[PDB]
Amino acid sequence: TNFDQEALLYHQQGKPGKIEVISSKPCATEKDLSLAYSPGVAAPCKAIAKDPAKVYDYTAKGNLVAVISNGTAVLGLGNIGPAAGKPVMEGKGILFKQFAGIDVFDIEVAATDVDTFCNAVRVLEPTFGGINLEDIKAPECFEIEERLKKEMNIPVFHDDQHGTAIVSGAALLNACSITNRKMEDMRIVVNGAGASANSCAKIFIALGARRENIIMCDSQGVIYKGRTAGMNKYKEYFASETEARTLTEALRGADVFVGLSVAGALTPEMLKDMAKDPIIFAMANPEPEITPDKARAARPDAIIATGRSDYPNQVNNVLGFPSIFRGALDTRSTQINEEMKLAAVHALAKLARMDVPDKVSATYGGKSFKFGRDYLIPKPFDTRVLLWVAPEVAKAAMKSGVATRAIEDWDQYRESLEAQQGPSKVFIRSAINRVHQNSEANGGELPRIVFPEGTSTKVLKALATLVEERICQPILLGYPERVKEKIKALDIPLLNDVQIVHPSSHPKYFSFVEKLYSLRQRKGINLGEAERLMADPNYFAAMMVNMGEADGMVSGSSINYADAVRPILQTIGTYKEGIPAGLNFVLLEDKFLVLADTTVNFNPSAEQCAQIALQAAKIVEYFGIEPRVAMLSYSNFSGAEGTPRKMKKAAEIARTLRPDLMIEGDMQADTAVNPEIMERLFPFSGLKGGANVLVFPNLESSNIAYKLIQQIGKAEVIGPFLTGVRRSANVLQRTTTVDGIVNSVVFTALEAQFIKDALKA
Ligand SMILES: NC(=O)c1ccc[n+]([C@@H]2O[C@H](COP(=O)([O-])OP(=O)(O)OC[C@H]3O[C@@H](n4cnc5c(N)ncnc54)[C@H](OP(=O)(O)O)[C@@H]3O)[C@@H](O)[C@H]2O)c1
């Protein structure tokens, strides 16, 4: 088919291969090269000589894992040599980085001999922090893995050996917990004994099971002690003394069936002879041992957990090894013992026993997952796997004593793992922590945020994420029966105690109408119009925030920006001199930039531009950053008629209002953001160090710039966030994702807290 040709093109387009080695530190200036190389490179080397433990602090040893192979068990191809298995190694390293943020040096060793292979790997100690054996044929894999573990003083893990056992072991706990099948009376049969099967039997035994109920099969029927030594000695370790010697006979009364063999190894005769709840594992990749559709045609009580991406409960190795190595490497452990492997088994099992956010669903075609029978293990592309399995593996290293580094703060450890998702995740987590610390000084009082669109799916999905973070107390607006129907349909268990208010049925509804009428009676609104407006949730939510029934509101997900801002501007107002304005955060690796005004004012005047700068400067001061404001123009300090004169005057007005801030203009965009340009060309400017607040002359420039930065610049931009309003209120867009709604609610909660304490003082 075209898939194989497309794969060849994927490995040949542009740069051949799939990996690239780049520098993580500045290496452009001569000073940069002198720091990275001689004579600056000698200083880190001296420290490692005195203290060998510093090799984990000055080099990339703490994040480097070697995927070493000899190419004798490359997938289903078999023994194709080490060079032919190179693309598999490169793909394995990609999975390591994409799911655990681990740098990988893939190694192919042209030595099929066990003794030669072990000596070559053993001398590679001072390079890598861990070794990942992969695609090594039996029985050579067992002997290589054992000696390497004893000799090498760094974690050694054969993914083909233990990786599948951990994922299947986690599924077994989830499968039995929904069938009342206590492991003490739990019969296990593994068909196709080999590299993975031996570890699977050992893993199950460590999971409260006994070898007496475990029987292993082979191509020559069912093996047992009566067989004349079978093959090798590894499979003889778990061999039982059961008289049965046929897969048909041995599967009678078998609680589970682990199909780690070739395709077409199941018959309906033993499919209807296992138990009241049989658990089967169709692990063969080229073709499943038993198709789930065929199994469903048989006894429906058969729990099926295959190993293919086209069916539920896929057993994927990518769930086990990235998080396990991340936990071992972060704790600087010296081994990957059974204690840590069991921790990953438990962590994966508990993770499936949890709610599935829309991020997992949207990744897999927008499906639904619950802890039932079609979802027994976390999905391979689930982001939370690293956030849950890795800390569990890290803890097991501490309790087993292998770990040589201490993780005292565990909340910081998860947010360090979460920080791998980008600067936007870091920025929002910092804002979430600020909300928590603001609430902690307020006595644990979370802000109340009302949503006029409780029927909206994106708002409801975002609220599922927001309640777990303890950011706010959400209030939904609408018919309680109509929104609870959608809450149940979308299956959020956390959104069950959430308060739902119908505007017309509220006890304070008629008091709200009188307040709206008194505010708008000489602005074209009569009593009949006020009653009709107050029935609209957007107007009702604005009056709850204005009166005090809520601290903030988030709307605009189902209407245009202009139609959603209007109730906020009419019910709530602006402050003494405030002006409504949209605000965007441009999140860079080192700093962040504030852009205003991006959504409201078409052509602000000099007085309005100065007010916009002051509002944006206060938002920057929320985070403890010193605001440095630049009025943007197409010219550099000219004051010519039009925009340059307006922006020059805007800076003068703003400096008068807040004389303790760095406000300057008019400049160009590159002059504002580059400190080197400012010092070289305009040393007279009062703005030093670069601007972090950017004020635009009109809406065309501000809107186009932040949308071009988001698209072309590939920088993280979050917003827009409404500013200049008397109370906390934010307006979404129809195109906002649930992640953008989460950021908007976090900003609304942050602004509500600041408005609350400012009003308190
Ligand atoms: N996705 C996963 O998590 C995962 C993990 C492991 C394996 N698998 C799949 O499961 C299969 C087996 O694993 P493997 O790669 O280790 O296999 P393998 O050893 O390469 O070959 C299967 C072995 O099982 C035995 N066997 C062959 N046909 C059999 C049959 N009809 N009934 C019973 N035993 C039979 C043979 O043992 P003798 O050599 O003693 O005759 C053979 O060596 C492969 O298809 C593999 O891709 C999937």
Residue numbers in the entry: 12 to 772
What text appears in the publication on this structure?
While reducing NAD(P)+ to NAD(P)H, MEs catalyze the oxidative decarboxylation of the TCA cycle intermediate L-malate to produce the TCA carbon source pyruvate and a byproduct carbon dioxide (CO2) in the presence of divalent metal ions such as a magnesium (Mg2+) ion. The hybrid-type MEs consist of an N-terminal catalytic domain (ME domain) and a C-terminal activity regulating domain.
The cofactors NADP+ and Mg2+ were added to the protein solution prior to the data collection. The structure of BbMaeBholo in the H state was determined at 2.59 Å resolution. This result is consistent with the previous crystallographic study and confirms that BbMaeB assumes the H state in the absence of acetyl-CoA.
